Amino acid sequence: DLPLDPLWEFPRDRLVLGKPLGEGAFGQVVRAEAFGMDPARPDQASTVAVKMLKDNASDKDLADLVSEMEVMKLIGRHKNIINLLGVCTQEGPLYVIMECAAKGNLREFLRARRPPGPDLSPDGPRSSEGPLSFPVLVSCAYQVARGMQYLESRKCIHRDLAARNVLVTEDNVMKIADFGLARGVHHIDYYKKTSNGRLPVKWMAPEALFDEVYTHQSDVWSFGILLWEIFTLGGSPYPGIPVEELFSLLREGHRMDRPPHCPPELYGLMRECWHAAPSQRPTFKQLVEALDKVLLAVSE
Ligand SMILES: CCC(=O)Nc1cc(N2CCC(N3CCOCC3)CC2)cc(F)c1Nc1n[nH]c2ccc(O[C@H](C)c3c(Cl)cncc3Cl)cc12
Known part of the structure; x- marks a missing residue:
């Protein structure tokens, strides 16, 4: 009907x-x-x-x-x-x-492909070599940025960009999911933990969390969080920080630390995405170009 x-x-x-x-x-x-x-x-x-x-x-x-x-x-x-x-x-x-993305979301993709620790008995010439390499991680970040750039050109704001909402195809192509969802931004339970333990508030830009203001730059903030997820191989942001503490820390201008085995170029982009002023954050077009330079410089 x-x-x-x-x-x-x-x-x-x-x-x-x-x-x-x-x-x-x-x-x-x-x-x-x-x-x-x-x-x-x-x-x-x-x-x-x-x-x-x-x-x-x-x-x-x-x-x-x-x-x-x-x-x-x-x-x-x-x-x-x-x-x-x-x-x-x-x-x-x-x-x-x-569309289908055979490999599930980006968060579970990364977490299932973390390198083995020194308790594995060396078996074969690549026993210390894990599924994930640096250029592929950069590629994942680049693809999400290009997708977000496209969504921005179509005047579409995601409002909850995260690794959980990025899907992975059989050929490791990043596909952004749930970009057209009504999310009820006027009644968010900021303390609400998902069944898989996620606290979605940790992905919100300050202007979105505090002022209920959503722009494409608020998505850029979230993208920065997503960058942190990628290079922590599916880690949860603001580790061990409950929502109550997150509120005050954010008001104090607290930012996440540089994760281990993460080059300064990429932590640099993260901090740029977390600039207090939305206008001082890079655009998705700039993120695409910035990540492209890194990707090309590591893909010989
Ligand atoms: C179409 C091919 C396929 O099955 N893809 C698939 C399986 C899964 N799963 C989830 C885990 C599940 N395992 C099974 C074993 O027990 C643990 C869970 C295996 C299948 C998750 C996905 F995101 C996907 N990828 C999706 N492709 N297309 C989608 C459209 C909507 C969609 O939504 C669900 C609610 C979803 C899920 Cl399930 C996980 N992350 C994000 C989203 Cl948006 C996921 C996919």
């Missing part, structure tokens, strides 16, 4: 729902097989991610998902974001079909 958009509409019978991936404030995500997503190959199978309402869904939950759907329609296609593939709005539950 939603209006039919033939541009995006996809036959729900061409979907085969599979294992649930996760749930969020107003919707849950399910992995599914899709047949003929490419109209040129009607019987071709592909793995997609389907977002839908829960079973305790209110009219507000539906409005948020519909709003998210329309946002994903408008923003367009970019390599470094999760793209809309199709929708199901006719004769059945509302489905929002988007």
Whole structure:
């Protein structure tokens, strides 16, 4: 009973729902097989991610998902974001079909690929060599910046940029997720800890936390936090600092320390992203160019 958009509409019978991936404030995500997503190959199978309402869904939950759907329609296609593939709005539950990223989010990707410590028995010529190398970490940071630059050009503010919301494909391509979400910025439980232990307040820019002001520069602040996550290999920001302490420390201008095995160039970018004045933080365009120089200088 939603209006039919033939541009995006996809036959729900061409979907085969599979294992649930996760749930969020107003919707849950399910992995599914899709047949003929490419109209040129009607019987071709592909793995997609389907977002839908829960079973305790209110009219507000539906409005948020519909709003998210329309946002994903408008923003367009970019390599470094999760793209809309199709929708199901006719004769059945509302489905929002988007791209798959096989390896999960960036935080879990990094944490599962930390190097082995000196308690492993040397076996092979690379027993001390881990899955993650410096140029790849820089690449991950570069791709997120380029994606954010794209979203900025489309006048889109993420409002909760984090490693948890960056997805990793089979080819280690970074794809920014959940950029068009209604997040209820006028009623944030700053003390609320997620089921995986995350405190989202630690990613908020000061103007967002204290003044409820969101700009693209507030996302830049979050990007700085995301930079810290990457080069801590999926570490949690402000280590061992409870929310109450975070409030006062931020008011005192406290910033995170330089993480171990992190070159000064990248901690430099982090601190620039954490400049008190939003205008003194780099733009995403500048971040892309800055990270590009580092990436090129380490990719011989
Ligand atoms: C489509 C291919 C696929 O399955 N991808 C996938 C699996 C997962 N998981 C989560 C962990 C899960 N393990 C299974 C074993 O027990 C521990 C959890 C394995 C599958 C997480 C993802 F982010 C993804 N990547 C996503 N691709 N496309 C998405 C669209 C929405 C989406 O949302 C969910 C709620 C999500 C999740 Cl589950 C984790 N981080 C961020 C997001 Cl936004 C994730 C993906």
